Amino acid sequence: HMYAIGLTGGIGSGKTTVADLFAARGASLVDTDLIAHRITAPAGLAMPAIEQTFGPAFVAADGSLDRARMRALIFSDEDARRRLEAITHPLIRAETEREARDAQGPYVIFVVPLLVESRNWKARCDRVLVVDCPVDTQIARVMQRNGFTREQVEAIIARQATREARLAAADDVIVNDAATPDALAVQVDALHQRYLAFAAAK
């Protein structure tokens, strides 16, 4: 068993920021969001199924997913959300095992936005690391980064687990609410070490 850490956290909480720090220290990163984008890019592994299931309406002229039109439809119709996720999730799952098999570091970190929401991911990981922060900080950061409105972010936040549920399912926690990310490194240093020890013991 390659030692596996699930890194999760709500939208805008800091998963990417924390993940990078662990990568700089030699952890092997498998970002399920990068995979989700590539499998729906031009020539992506998920596109045949998506065209078939949704129609050429949702395939843009470059072959990729029309992320806009879809962005709307799965918000509008949560029968459609489940229909898309039923295509993408198994593929993401699969690409994850495949990247994990090839990973060269002493342990792996799977960056998984909807980790605790899913039964399968908790079982797949040796530990869960939650990057936590207040909901209003999530909102401000995601408005700033992606240009959305409150309502748009609030809508994603509502489709995700509460802070309390996330914190309850954690083995490890990094509260990322400082004005600045410079102090995160101290926390990541210590977790890295503990992770090396965990892995070595298994």
Which residues make up the interface to ligand ADP (CB under 6 A)? 9, 11-17, 141, 145, 176, 178-181
Could you say whether residue 90 binds a second copy (CB under 8 A)? yes
From a second copy, ligand ADP, none, interface partner of 61 (C-beta below 5 to 8 A by class) = none
Residue 158 or 201 having the CB closest to a second copy: 201
Residue 2 or 156 having the CB closest to a second copy: 2
Residue 52 or 193 having the CB closest to a second copy: 52
Shortest spacing between CB 154 and a second copy, in angstroms: 31
Could you say whether residue 200 binds a second copy (CB under 8 A)? no
Could you say whether residue 97 binds a second copy (CB under 8 A)? yes
Three-state SS string across the chain, please? CCCEEEEECCCCCCHHHHHHHHHHCCCEEEEHHHHHHHCCCCCCCCHHHHHHHHCHHHECCCCCECHHHHHHHHHHCHHHHHHHHHHHHHHHHHHHHHHHHHCCCCCEEEECCCCCCCHHHHHHCCEEEEEECCHHHHHHHHHHHHCCCHHHHHHHHHCCCCHHHHHHCCCEEEECCCCCCCCHHHHHHHHHHHHHHHHHCC
> Do the annotations mark residue 146 as ligand-binding?
no
Tokens of 198: 């965990």
Could you say whether residue 169 binds a second copy (CB under 8 A)? no
Could you say whether residue 51 binds a second copy (CB under 8 A)? yes
Torsional sign, CA 71, 76, 138, 88: negative
Q: What is the CA radius of gyration of the chain?
A: 17
Could you say whether residue 89 binds a second copy (CB under 8 A)? yes
Site track 114-133 with a second copy (rule: CB under 8 A), x = hit: -----xx--xxxx-------
Annotated binding site for ADP: 12-17, 145, 176, 178, 180
Contact residues for a second copy, defined by CB under 8 A: 1-2, 4, 43, 45-46, 48-49, 51-53, 63, 83, 86-87, 89-91, 93-95, 97-98, 100-101, 119-120, 123-126
